[PDB]
Design a protein around this ligand. Sequence first.
Ligand SMILES: CC(C)C[C@H](CC(=O)NO)C(=O)N[C@H](C(=O)N[C@@H](C)C(=O)NCCN)C(C)(C)C
Ligand SMILES: [Zn+2]
Length: 254
Amino acid sequence: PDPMKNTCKLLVVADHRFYRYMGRGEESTTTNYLIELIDRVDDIYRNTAWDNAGFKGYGIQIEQIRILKSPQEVKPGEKHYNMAKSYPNEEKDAWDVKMLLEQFSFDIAEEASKVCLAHLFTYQDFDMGTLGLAYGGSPHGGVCPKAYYSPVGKKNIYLNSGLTSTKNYGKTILTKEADLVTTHELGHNFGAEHDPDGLAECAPNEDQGGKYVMYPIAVSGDHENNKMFSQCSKQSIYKTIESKAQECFQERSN
Ligand SMILES: CC(C)C[C@H](CC(=O)NO)C(=O)N[C@H](C(=O)N[C@@H](C)C(=O)NCCN)C(C)(C)C
Ligand SMILES: [Zn+2]
């Protein structure tokens, strides 16, 4: 490992929904929630030995927290990830999750080009229990901005993005649950795919510690393995870090 290239700096964005519902309409409350969450997530990553030996000390740190205190004003027919209404159905509490991730990536493109990852934190009830979405680790995108020319958007957007909502089924998720969602979405950014049932090593039974963080289902969160990465995730992320650290990782701060 290269201590001068072992940290993925993040642009963290709190939309107006997050500001109001999680942040109590305050910069301090909003930021303190995110600072602490990212730090707990960083503990998982930083202590992980990707090759099961010395390849460790790789993690994440916040470069900037953008705080959107009010909805984004838009013209008719125009959309923005921070606009007041949900899209495509304004009668729903939330956007279609995939469309939101794409919109966020479009709107945040110039800023995203300057950081390892950009992550949106919002407060909306996605349909059917969905909690987050991210590019990378999909059967592209992930760490370090990679351009994608959007025919619809008419400009380059970058696929180094993901999002977490802290609302599910009409209530605020537990902080221990939020940590897991963000760890999982950034896991995809870092190159991990979902742990498949067919590999017991990567998807253990409850008596053996339970599932690892990259399992595709989220329920409970009280088992030992739940907060950690499986050997399958480690192998994928290891390869990702090896190819990407020199490209956009930086020295750990503080
Ligand atoms: C951190 C979790 C695992 C993220 C995934 C989606 C995903 O793979 N993000 O990369 C999720 O939202 N999973 C949901 C989930 O398990 N949600 C739980 C909290 C839930 O609401 N379960 C009840 C739904 N009948 C799905 C999509 C499986 C319904
Ligand atoms: Zn996933």
